Each structure stands twice: as structure tokens, then as C-alpha cells.
Design a protein around this ligand. Structure first.
Ligand code: TYD
Ligand code: BGC
Ligand code: K
Lengths: 7, 401
């Protein structure tokens, strides 16, 4: 993680 | 005395940090904030020294994009922990305490540096769904075992997954600076006792949880609305405001388009917050108005209703503003907050992230009903607990000891 999302 | 604030998150987490920095200032305590590069403008605005940590906004993923390959996910996971050990030592110079907000993994790195420097450490969460218990399922921020709904299992699996993904890096970096390894990796980032930075009436701490509910962390936003927006509000009836904050993807663009349609169908003007993915209005008719960053605490008291994503900050702001709310939840703690708006009778919790003209219209009708307004106004007076003040005292009391 560290760049957003959500997956 | 100076306190270091470390934020690994979006606009919402930065504002939570800004609110504490403001209360510390009033007490004569200086502050410094480690935050993503995107926090620059906001931090400059409030005069809080910024130590850039993390990727720039243009490298942020958007809802809908394919997940990165496992190797890349692992690289980011390690980066998240490693950037703390690289940046926090320097940023902590001359500080008496450290307060972390946002990503838990980042928090484990922050707490480790604080532990090395012998500084008290505090971590806060914006809602109860970020605190493990059998009462509420974890925030919807990662895929979970297909078919599992059992609250206890979800937390146990969430924690095991976390420890396995970040534990190795955390403990390796800890060892490099002489610290013994952490065995309870998931628990470590929360500090000795996490602070639930949310209002006790809007988002009540659940039982069986060792945490301190301070109340929401907000500052009195004195910023004036831009002239062009002040004029629009004057030249017409109270419009309905649309805004999805740090949300992204095509879904919110579609939602916004439908929201404008529904709002118009009820003979109401529209104000649309563009957001960082630059949402656009359907046309140029003078019954609508698009805006960028604006004082919501001020704007929200001059609108008939607000349609938003349900993130903690925007909802707290709307709640204390007494404005009816239409929540379109998309992820993390938004379904929780949407349910809170429903339970308090201050608006509608839209069923899902993808509204249609029909579902949005039905919700809007309710939201604009006089009962809802009366109820919102009433509730607005029950959520004034000053969390930042409560948090600042805990911090100072720790430094005192
Ligand atoms: C987008 C935006 C947000 N806000 C502020 C008020 C909220 O307290 C704060 C954080 O909101 P929040 O919804 O928690 O953040 P996110 O959208 O990242 O999940 O943002 C404004 O005042 N004006 C704006 O134009
Ligand atoms: C951004 O996502 C992190 C999780 O990695 C969460 O802790 C923050 O609150 C959110 O803004
Ligand atoms: K959120």
C-alpha cells in the first residue's frame, strides 16, 4: 500500500 | 516544546493533523508535520512546517484501476515502512512527542523511531471500524476472504495478513537501529492506546475496545468563501452541494452526473466540487456552479443539502453544520458513516456507490424533507465535543510524565 486504492 | 505529526493518508488525515497542530499552537506548542507532498498547499495555508514523505498525488491509484503485480505491491509495502525510518529521525529533531495518523504500517515505522528516541507516541483513527472488536467489521480497504462475514475472523485475518506483509521489513529496519523485533505487528502501530478521533454521538466507540475517544479533531475554519461563489449563493435559492473528496475513478463522475440530474428534477441549483480527478458539470447553465477547494464549514451552513462520499471529516463537518446529508458510500469507513447518518435521521444512506436517477431522486426527496432539516439542526448541537483539545492534553500529559 502507499498509493491509494481500493482494490 | 515541539510535537511531530506524521500523516500517511489523504486530505482527511492531513486535516485531522492540521486540527491538532492548531490546538497545540494555541497552547504555545510548536508543530512539524511529515505528510505526503500533496499536503503542501494546506500546510502552507496554516503555517505548519512540512516534511514531504510519500508519493506525489499524480502517482496515486484510482478506484477501477487494476491492482499492481504482487512484486510491486510488496515494494510499496516496504517503501511505506522504510520511508519512516529514513525521514522521521530528522523530522523528530527537537520534538517531545510524536502523533501519527493514517496508514497503520507507516505508523509502525513512526512508533519505532519514537521508541528509539524515547519519545511518547500516539496514533489516532477516524472511526470505530479501524479498531478491532467483535462488534464491527474492519474498514473496507482491502479484499477479504471470499464468503467471510464473521467479524472476529475478518479481524484475525486482517491482522495476520498485516503482520506477514509488513513484519519482515519493520523488524529488519528496527534491528538496523538496534531495536528488538516487534511480535504483535498489527497491534504495535496503534501505540499503547489508540485515540478514536471521532465524535462520541456521531461515531460512538464500541465496547470491548481499549481506546480513548477524544471526539473529532477539527479547527474553526475561518477561511472566507471565494467571491465568485459568494455571488452564486446570493443570486438564487439554497443549492444542493455535491462533493466526494479524495474519491476517484469514473464511478464518481457518473454519480455526479446523476446527482445534477436529480437535483434539477427537484428544481434546485447545484454546486459541484471538482475534486482532484476534476469532476465536470453536464453543461454551462447558470443553475449550477463548479468549485475547487473551499471552506466547507462555511459553505455547508449555506446549502439545502450535501451529497458526499461518507468519509469521516466531510460527514462530521456536515453534521455539526446541521445540513441534511445524502451519503453515497464507496469504501473504507463510508458504509459505516452512511449508516450513522441514517440512524440519526439526518439524511439518507444511499444503498451502494452507484446511484441511478431513481434511487438518487428517492433519497434526495427524503433528504430535502423539513423533518430531516429539523433533525439535522437538532443533532448538530450534540456533536461539538472538542477532540483536538482532548488529544492535545493527552499528549502534553504524556510529555509531562
Ligand atoms: C474537498 C474539501 C475538503 N474539506 C475538508 C473538510 C474535512 O474536514 C476535510 C477531510 O475530509 P474527509 O472527507 O475526511 O477526507 P477524504 O475525502 O480524504 O476521505 O476536508 C474542505 O474544507 N474543503 C474542501 O473543498
Ligand atoms: C488512507 O488509507 C489508510 C490505509 O492504508 C487509512 O489508514 C487512512 O485513514 C486513509 O485516509
Ligand atoms: K474514509
Amino acid at each position: 500500500x502507499x498509493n491509494x486504492x481500493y482494490x | 516544546m515541539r510535537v511531530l505529526l506524521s500523516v500517511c493518508g489523504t486530505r482527511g488525515d492531513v486535516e485531522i493533523g492540521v486540527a491538532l497542530a492548531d490546538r497545540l499552537k494555541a497552547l504555545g506548542v510548536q508543530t512539524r508535520m511529515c505528510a505526503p507532498p500533496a499536503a503542501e498547499e494546506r500546510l502552507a495555508e496554516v503555517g505548519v512546517p512540512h516534511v514531504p514523505v510519500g508519493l506525489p498525488q499524480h502517482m496515486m491509484l484510482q478506484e477501477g484501476m487494476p491492482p499492481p503485480p504482487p512484486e510491486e505491491e510488496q515494494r510499496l509495502a516496504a517503501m511505506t515502512v522504510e520511508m519512516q525510518f529514513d525521514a522521521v529521525p530528522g523530522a523528530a529533531e527537537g520534538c517531545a512527542a510524536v502523533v501519527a495518523v493514517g496508514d497503520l504500517a507507516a505508523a509502525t515505522g513512526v512508533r519505532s523511531v519514537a521508541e528509539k528516541l524515547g519519545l511518547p507516541f500516539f496514533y489516532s483513527v477516524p472511526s470505530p471500524v479501524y479498531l478491532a472488536s467483535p462488534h464491527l467489521p474492519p474498514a473496507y480497504d482491502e479484499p477479504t476472504t471470499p464468503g467471510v462475514t464473521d467479524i472476529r475472523v475478518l479481524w484475525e485475518e486482517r491482522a495476520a495478513r498485516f503482520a506477514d506483509r509488513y513484519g519482515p521489513t519493520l523488524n529488519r529496519r528496527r534491528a538496523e537501529i538496534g531495536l528488538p523485533p516487534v511480535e504483535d505487528v498489527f497491534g504495535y502501530g496503534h501505540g499503547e492506546r489508540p485515540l478514536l478521533a471521532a465524535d462520541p454521538v456521531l461515531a460512538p466507540l464500541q465496547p470491548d475496545v481499549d481506546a480513548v475517544q477524544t471526539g473529532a479533531w477539527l479547527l474553526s475554519d475561518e477561511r472566507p468563501l471565494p467571491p465568485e461563489l459568494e455571488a452564486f449563493l446570493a443570486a438564487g435559492s439554497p443549492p444542493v452541494h455535491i462533493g466526494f473528496g479524495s474519491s476517484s475513478g469514473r464511478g464518481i463522475a457518473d454519480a455526479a452526473k446523476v446527482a445534477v440530474e436529480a437535483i434539477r428534477a427537484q428544481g434546485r441549483r447545484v454546486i459541484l466540487s471538482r475534486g482532484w480527478t476534476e469532476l465536470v458539470l453536464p453543461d454551462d447553465r447558470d443553475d449550477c456552479f463548479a468549485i475547487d477547494e473551499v471552506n466547507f464549514q462555511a459553505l455547508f451552513r449555506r446549502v439545502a443539502a450535501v451529497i458526499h462520499h461518507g468519509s469521516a471529516g466531510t460527514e462530521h463537518v456536515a453534521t455539526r453544520a446541521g445540513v441534511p446529508q445524502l451519503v453515497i458510500p464507496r469504501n473504507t469507513d463510508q458504509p459505516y458513516f452512511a449508516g450513522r447518518v441514517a440512524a440519526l435521521g439526518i439524511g439518507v444512506a444511499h444503498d451502494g456507490p452507484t446511484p441511478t436517477f431513481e434511487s438518487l431522486s428517492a433519497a434526495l426527496t427524503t433528504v430535502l424533507a423539513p423533518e430531516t432539516r429539523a433533525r439535522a439542526e437538532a443533532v448538530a448541537g450534540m456533536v461539538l465535543t472538542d477532540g483536538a483539545a482532548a488529544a492535545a492534553d493527552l499528549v502534553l500529559a504524556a510529555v509531562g510524565r
